[PDB]
Symmetry: C3
Subunit: 117 residues, 3 copies
């Protein structure tokens, strides 16, 4: 079976642990819903944050998902683009799937709805 | 048929949107040419920039490739390494392919030729 | 032909090329041993460093592994988390494997042992 990336983006209003975990968790839950994703079928996840977020690693939210404790995940710093969306958390979830490239459901929540094509 | 990463790297002279998109597009086009890559066979793409580039997300270049609108892509900051090549943009393009690991054609352009194997 | 991420993390005491390369090599070797990984089965690898490390790209240590010269690798900056583990190097090695997700052997060494689930 083919492997496919699934993108997500969301934002927080302030650099706190509560915000980052809550919003990341909601972002992951929305992607799982739209793509019917099962954790055994997740190759890996990459989470990024803009350099104005430091309170907590977003990946901590992944363990708030029952069954996902073995999904490998790592975080990275997003580049700082002049005029770019602030306080932004992004996800690239790599999954085993038969779903055609153009039918993959990429999820944009909160202030990240402006990045969606 | 297996999944493999394809690497690219290039540089720009000025932190401007026009040059970052021009050089990134040229890099992607060269990778596409050398590896005969179709966009539906692309699992996902990661683009990075050294911390001295801020004008635009290099991923914006991907959208000016005809047929590549559904290819998931995200950006990250390259590690800041002392004496490293400056104003550098890199790509990791993950594809489905029959080509053996030692035969994949990784691409290094402009000043990033000194990184070439 | 399922694909799975393997995670690794380690730390160094001083920001020198010698220690970064040595600890990175040791981390990779432990991962390759625990998972029985052959370089041809590696899709790609991502390595990260916290922003307190600047001496060398950790990826340089990969070419000290005989047979690994064609494995595509790139590096990124880990996000700077307040109170986060300092001087930390991480790996996400993406591999073709039939080992189930719960049996993948992720490796945490030196001071990174605190990151284990
Ligand atoms: O290396 C790690 O495993 C730890 C844990 C972590 C998480 O919170 O899940 C996952 C990935 C890393 O970016 C961070 C956060 O350090
Ligand atoms: O793009 C590259 O190929 C070069 C080489 C490098 C390494 O030292 O292995 C590997 C990946 C990149 O992050 C850096 C370091 O630039």
């Amino acid at each position: 079976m083919m492997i496919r990336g699934i993108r997500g983006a969301t934002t927080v209003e302030r650099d706190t642990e509560e915000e980052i975990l809550q919003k990341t968790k909601q972002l992951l839950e929305k992607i799982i819903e739209e793509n019917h994703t099962k954790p055994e079928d997740v190759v890996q996840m990459l989470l990024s944050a803009t350099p104005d977020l430091h309170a907590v690693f977003p990946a901590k939210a992944v363990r708030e998902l029952s069954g996902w404790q073995y999904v490998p995940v790592t975080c990275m710093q997003e580049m700082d683009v002049t005029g770019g969306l602030k306080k932004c958390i992004r996800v690239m979830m790599t999954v085993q799937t038969d779903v055609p490239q153009e039918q993959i459901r990429h999820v944009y929540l909160e202030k990240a709805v402006v990045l969606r094509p």
